[PDB]
Design a binder for this molecule. Structure first.
Ligand code: LTJ
Ligand code: CL
Length: 259
């Protein structure tokens, strides 16, 4: 729902997000928040504000908590809880010396559990990647910004920022987004986690990745991934969406491996 703009105090810039500037703030003199600044003309506002009511209801412990919006003037505020360790990708890249396989599996489990919740509500993320998940002070991973690419108005010029390297073939060929394309992206995220934040298909440009993935190329097993864990991420990358597991099945598959 709608928040009172003056009940948000902006404290410092967190950086430039996919959707604009993001600020650390305080809400109601009590709660630590992140505030996404949404500029005029950047979003299909009608569609977004309908979905903003959906975002508010889609609450889960492994989803970043959405508090509300300030929508009556620009910039629009999207207000979420503050998650202190920032994006999962940079966490991996700066904590690899201390991270062990059991913790890496727990990170994947957290994301899978949030995604199973979204799947159960027929909600498609569209842009799952380690860069888009957040790590809290207790190393719980939370899914963030789910669904937000749908309301972006700017041409992505599919040089492009379009996330080909996380995209199932039906996404890069047909732009067909589904919970099964989210599953493909989840497998790529599992690879990012177990590789301690490597870039997928590092030596290759987007055109090379479309051809190689179309021809059956898949990411190699990270050193820290067991055969069982590799089989889980690899199962996410079937050419056919109907041959990929659901997030409910993946969650089932990961649970017995936790330590
Ligand atoms: C990783 C590869 C990226 C990254 O951390 N990017 C930044 C860009 C600025 C905004 N960032 C951001 C955010 F959007 C939300 C939160 C939050 N809900 O707490 C957040 N916390 C931190 C510490 C950052 C940097 C955050 C992500
Ligand atoms: Cl590796």
């Amino acid at each position: 729902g709608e928040l009172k703009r003056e009940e948000i105090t902006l404290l410092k810039e967190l950086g430039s997000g996919q959707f604009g500037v993001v600020q650390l703030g305080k809400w109601k003199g009590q709660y630590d928040v992140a505030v996404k600044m949404i500029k005029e003309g950047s979003m299909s506002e009608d569609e977004f504000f309908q979905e903003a009511q959906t975002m508010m209801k889609l609450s889960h412990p492994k989803l970043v908590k959405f508090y509300g919006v300030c929508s009556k003037e620009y910039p629009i505020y999207i207000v979420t809880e503050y998650i202190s360790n920032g994006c999962l990708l940079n966490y991996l890249r700066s904590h690899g010396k201390g991270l062990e396989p059991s913790q890496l599996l727990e990170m994947c489990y957290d994301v899978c559990e949030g995604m199973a919740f979204l799947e159960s509500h027929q909600f498609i993320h569209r842009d799952l990647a380690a860069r888009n998940c957040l790590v809290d002070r207790d190393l719980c991973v939370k899914v963030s910004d789910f669904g937000m690419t749908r309301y972006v108005l700017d041409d992505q010029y599919v040089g492009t920022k379009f996330p080909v390297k996380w995209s199932a073939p039906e996404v890069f060929h047909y732009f067909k987004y589904s919970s099964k394309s989210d599953v493909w992206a989840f497998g790529i995220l599992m690879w990012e986690v177990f590789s301690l934040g490597k870039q997928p298909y590092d030596l290759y440009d987007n055109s090379q990745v479309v051809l190689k993935v179309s021809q059956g190329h898949r990411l190699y097993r990270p050193h820290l991934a067991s055969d069982t864990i590799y089989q889980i991420m690899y199962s996410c990358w079937h050419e056919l969406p109907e041959k990929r597991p659901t997030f409910q099945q993946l969650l089932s598959s990961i649970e017995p491996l936790r330590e």
